[PDB]
Amino acid sequence: DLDSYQIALEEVLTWLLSAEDTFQEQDDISDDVEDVKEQFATHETFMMELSAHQSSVGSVLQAGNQLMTQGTLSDEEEFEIQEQMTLLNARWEALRVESMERQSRLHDALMELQK
Ligand SMILES: [Mg+2]
């Protein structure tokens, strides 16, 4: 219902706020092959973390969609939810893109530094 959607959302946003912060405080790509390997490894682990939380993110977005389409909510409640989902989707997609670009650069670095 609305209550269980709000609780799922809070949990997802708490996780995501820390995932964004963790991603932001990664060191810039090193020139040493052994350091780039550790950074490649750390980022691969983070990419699986992101992966594992995808279904919780989809769940909250699905729950919010159902609640809005079912027509049982107040105009204010539908306002709040639309705003919540909009913001969540924006941040989730932004983190997806950024982390994928990070992975590409680390991948290209590791290969170049090994050849
Ligand atoms: Mg209404």
Residue numbers in the entry: 310 to 424
According to the publication:
The Utr N-terminal spectrin repeat 1 (Utr-SR1) crystallised with two molecules in the asymmetric unit of the P212121 cell and has been refined to a final model with crystallographic R and Rfree values of 0.200 and 0.235 with diffraction data of outer limit 1.95 Å resolution. Helix A (Utr 310–334; Dys 340–364, residue number is offset by +30 for Dys-SR1 relative to Utr-SR1) is shorter than B (Utr 342–379; Dys 372–409) and C (Utr 384–423; Dys 414–453) with the triple helix structure changing to coiled-coil formed between the B and C helices after the C-terminal end of helix A, a conserved feature for spectrin repeats domains. Helices A and C are straight but helix B has an appreciable bend in the centre with the loss of canonical main chain n+4 helical hydrogen bonding for residues Utr 360–361.This bending of helix B, a conserved spectrin repeat domain structural motif, is stabilised by conserved side chain stacking interactions between H362 and W324 (helix A) in combination with W401 (helix C) augmenting the hydrophobic heptad repeat central domain core. H362 is not strictly conserved for Utr/Dys or homologous repeats often replaced by Pro, that is also accommodated within the helix B bend. Analysis of molecular packing in the Utr-SR1 crystal revealed an interaction predicted to be relevant with respect to oligomerisation burying 1260 Å2 surface area between monomers A and B. However size exclusion chromatography data for Utr/Dys-SR1, as well as previous studies, show that Utr (and Dys) are monomeric suggesting that the degree of association observed in the crystal is most likely owing to crystal packing and the non-globular nature of the SR tertiary structure. Curiously the Utr-SR1 (and Utr-SR1-L) structures are the first single spectrin repeat structures determined by x-ray crystallography in the Protein Data Bank; the single drosophila α-spectrin repeat 14 structure has been determined but crystallizes in a domain-swapped dimer conformation rather than the isolated three-helix bundle fold and Dys-SR1 is disulphide linked.
Dystrophin is a large (427 kD) multidomain protein expressed in skeletal and cardiac muscle where it binds to the dystrophin-associated glycoprotein (DAG) complex of the plasma membrane and to F-actin connecting the cytoskeleton to the membrane. Utrophin (Utr), the 395 kD autosomal homologue of Dys is widely expressed in non muscle tissues (reviewed) but is restricted to the myotendinous and neuromuscular junctions of differentiated muscle and is located at the sarcolemma of developing fetal muscle. Dys and Utr potentially act as cellular biomechanical shock-absorbers limiting damage to the plasma membrane with the spectrin repeat domains acting as spring units by undergoing force-induced unfolding. Dys and Utr-SR1 adopt the canonical spectrin repeat fold comprising a triple helical bundle displaying an approximately cylindrical structure of overall dimensions ∼60 Å length and ∼9 Å radius (between backbone atoms).
